[PDB]
Structure 1
Amino acid sequence: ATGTGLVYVDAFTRFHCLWDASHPECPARVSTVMEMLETEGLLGRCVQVEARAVTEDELLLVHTKEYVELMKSTQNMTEEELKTLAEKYDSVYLHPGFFSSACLSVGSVLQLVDKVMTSQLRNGFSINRPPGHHAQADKMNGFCMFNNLAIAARYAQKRHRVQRVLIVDWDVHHGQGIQYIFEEDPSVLYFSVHRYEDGSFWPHLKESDSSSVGSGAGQGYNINLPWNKVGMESGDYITAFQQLLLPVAYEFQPQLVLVAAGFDAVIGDPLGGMQVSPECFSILTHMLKGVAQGRLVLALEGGYNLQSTAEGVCASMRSLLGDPCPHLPSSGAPCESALKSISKTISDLYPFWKSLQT
């Protein structure tokens, strides 16, 4: 009843890049996380929750039938056919076990949502791969096949009659797939903090700027915080959460919080270029527990330094378990660049949120 759920299955390690032995999205990502959770004594304090395969109908909450059929067919393809198809998308690989593992990756999040919404667990973390936040209605993208958290949000709405879901994406990349799926939807609030650099950082989209606030019925319910300098630190994230994200979150009154919990913003990541201490994520996780009765589910997205990502997961897990907020190595003030970005996003979202009108 008062526990923290954890999902991990060996299938999460049974796919990898056949044609690039050094691809950063690899099985060692999750096995290293699991090893550190054990050596830190955190794994044994969690409630083990079994994974399950997403159903076709659940995938169709977000993805097209044509795309689901195509992805289902990759389990029977030759390596040459997998490479030919993978190259039709931006930055993906395929593997005979990718579809099977991707279905368990979605399902792991749904399993935690079930436990949390029925008050059987307080919160949970899925240690899943492949990641999801770049996947789109009809295409793979950015190492992702299915959009784990977008499916989970719509599942929570359909299965548990949740009205409002908050998705917080602290991966260093913009989860444009999530943004696109919910762009016109005021019932799912999407917040992303990400490296941008005027579009020079992948995925190079103007829609990743803070001027993209949602459209149609969804205006105000998409919040982008783009960083335009590398080297951001814990203080930059803490400031953004205290004065932008959490004021909006309390005004929105979500009934479930889903976190796209990537750790490629952590110190040492080979792709992210940021300097956030892993301990920062204990603090960010604590803040999110005050909303939605603490009904909080984290799911692994990116993070490609094996040690840094494990440390980030552990720091988040200590907070889910209710351990004391840890002292931070560098509790410095935010930098000028971060403050410019935060001010501009606040400016763009001001008309929609009373809690930002200060």
Structure 2
Amino acid sequence: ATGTGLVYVDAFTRFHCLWDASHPECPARVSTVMEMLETEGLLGRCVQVEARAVTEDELLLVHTKEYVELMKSTQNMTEEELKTLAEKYDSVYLHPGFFSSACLSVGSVLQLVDKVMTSQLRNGFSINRPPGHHAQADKMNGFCMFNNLAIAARYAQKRHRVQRVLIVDWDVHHGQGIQYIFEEDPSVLYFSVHRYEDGSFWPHLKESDSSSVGSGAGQGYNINLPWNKVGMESGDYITAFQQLLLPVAYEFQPQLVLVAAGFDAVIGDPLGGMQVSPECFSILTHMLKGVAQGRLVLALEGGYNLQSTAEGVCASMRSLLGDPCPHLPSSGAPCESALKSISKTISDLYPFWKSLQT
């Protein structure tokens, strides 16, 4: 009842980029996480939860039937056919086992949602690949086939009857797929902090700026925090949570929190350009446990330095398990650029959240 669930299956290693041996999204990402969780003694403290394959009806909560069928057909394609299809999307590869692994990747999150919503566990972490946060209703994107967390949010609502879900995306990239899926939906609050640099950084979208607040019934329920300088640190992230995310989260009163738990903002990542210590993620995880009765599920997104990502997962897991947060050496104060971004996001979201008004 007070336990932390962990989902991992060997199938998560059974796909890789056939035409580029240097591709950063590779099986070692999850192997190294599991090895470090074990050597740190954290794996044995978790409740191992079985994965399952997502069903078609679960996928259809987010994705179109035509897209699901096309993705299913990739399991029977030749390498040349896989490459031709992958080239129709941005930043994607395909492999004959990609679809099977992607189905287990979604299902791993759903299994944890079941355990957490029924109070059989307190919280949990899926150690899954492929990632999900860029996947869209009818498109692969950014190493993603199916939108793991968007499916999990709608599943929590349909199966477990949850009214409000908060999705917190701390991967260094903007989860535009999640934003698009819930753009008009006030029942799923999406918060993303991400490198932006005025669009210079992938995925180069105007709608990754803080002016994209959602639309229609969803106006105010999409919150982007774009960083416009590299080198952000733990104090920048903690300050963003203290000034912006936590006040809104308590006002929103979510009944489940899902985290797009990428670790490409950790120091040493080859792509992220940030300098966040792995230990920061103990604090950020702790800061999210005070809403939704602690019903908190993390799912792996990006993160490409094998050691940095494994250290970030372990730091998050220590907090899920209830270990006291470490002291961080830095003061917690944000740099000027981070403060500028936080203030601008608050300015854009002020009209929709009493907890931000001054």
Structure 1 equivalent of residue 245 of structure 2 = 245
SS in 2 for 1:210: coil
Distance 1:145 1:130 in 2: 7
The Cα shift of 1:329 comes to 2.9
| Percentage of identical aligned residues | 100
Provide runs of 4+ in structure 1 moved above 4 Å.
none
Deviations 1:188-247 (A, max 9, x none): 000000000000000000100000000010000000000000000000000000010000
Deviations 1:288-333 (A, max 9, x none): 0000000000000000000000000000000000000101132342
Distance 1:207 1:310 in 2: 31
SS in 1 for 2:172: coil
Matched-pair contact (CA < 8 Å) for 2:196–2:204: yes
Deviations 1:117-173 (A, max 9, x none): 000000000000000000000000000000000000000000000000000000000
Matched-pair contact (CA < 8 Å) for 1:113–1:152: yes
Matched-pair contact (CA < 8 Å) for 2:106–2:152: yes
Deviations 1:56-78 (A, max 9, x none): 00000000000000000000000
SS in 1 for 2:129: coil
Distance 1:71 1:65 in 2: 10
Deviations 1:220-279 (A, max 9, x none): 000000000000000000000001000000000000000000000000000100000000
Deviations 1:168-195 (A, max 9, x none): 0000000000000000000000000000
Matched-pair contact (CA < 8 Å) for 2:238–2:332: no
Matched-pair contact (CA < 8 Å) for 2:184–2:219: yes
The Cα shift of 1:356 comes to 0.2
Distance 1:105 1:79 in 2: 22
Distance 1:159 1:271 in 2: 37
Deviations 1:18-58 (A, max 9, x none): 00011000000000000000000000000000000000000
Matched-pair contact (CA < 8 Å) for 1:134–1:175: yes
Distance 1:22 1:101 in 2: 20
Matched-pair contact (CA < 8 Å) for 1:257–1:296: yes
Distance 2:334 2:255 in 1: 31
Matched-pair contact (CA < 8 Å) for 2:92–2:140: yes
Distance 2:10 2:102 in 1: 13
Alignment of 1:83-232 (within 5 A): 83-232=83-232
SS in 2 for 1:223: strand
Distance 1:332 1:140 in 2: 37
Aligned length: 358
Distance 2:290 2:327 in 1: 20
Matched-pair contact (CA < 8 Å) for 2:126–2:300: yes
Matched-pair contact (CA < 8 Å) for 1:234–1:331: no
Distance 2:332 2:313 in 1: 22
SS in 2 for 1:258: strand
Distance 2:202 2:331 in 1: 29
Instruction: Say which is worse superposed, 323-332 or 51-60, in terms of deviation.
Output: 323-332
Distance 2:34 2:105 in 1: 15
Distance 2:172 2:331 in 1: 20
Distance 1:329 1:38 in 2: 26
Matched-pair contact (CA < 8 Å) for 2:58–2:151: yes
| Structure 1: gaps (5+ residues) | none
CA RMSD of aligned residues (A): 0.4
TM-score by length of 1: 1.00
SS in 1 for 2:189: strand
Structure 2 equivalent of residue 271 of structure 1 = 271
TM-score by length of 2: 1.00
Matched-pair contact (CA < 8 Å) for 2:239–2:332: no
SS in 2 for 1:150: helix
Matched-pair contact (CA < 8 Å) for 2:270–2:305: yes
The Cα shift of 1:15 comes to 0.2
Instruction: Say which is worse superposed, 122-131 or 324-333, in terms of deviation.
Output: 324-333
Matched-pair contact (CA < 8 Å) for 1:208–1:224: yes
Structure 1 equivalent of residue 56 of structure 2 = 56
SS in 1 for 2:89: coil
Matched-pair contact (CA < 8 Å) for 1:134–1:147: yes
Matched-pair contact (CA < 8 Å) for 2:267–2:308: yes
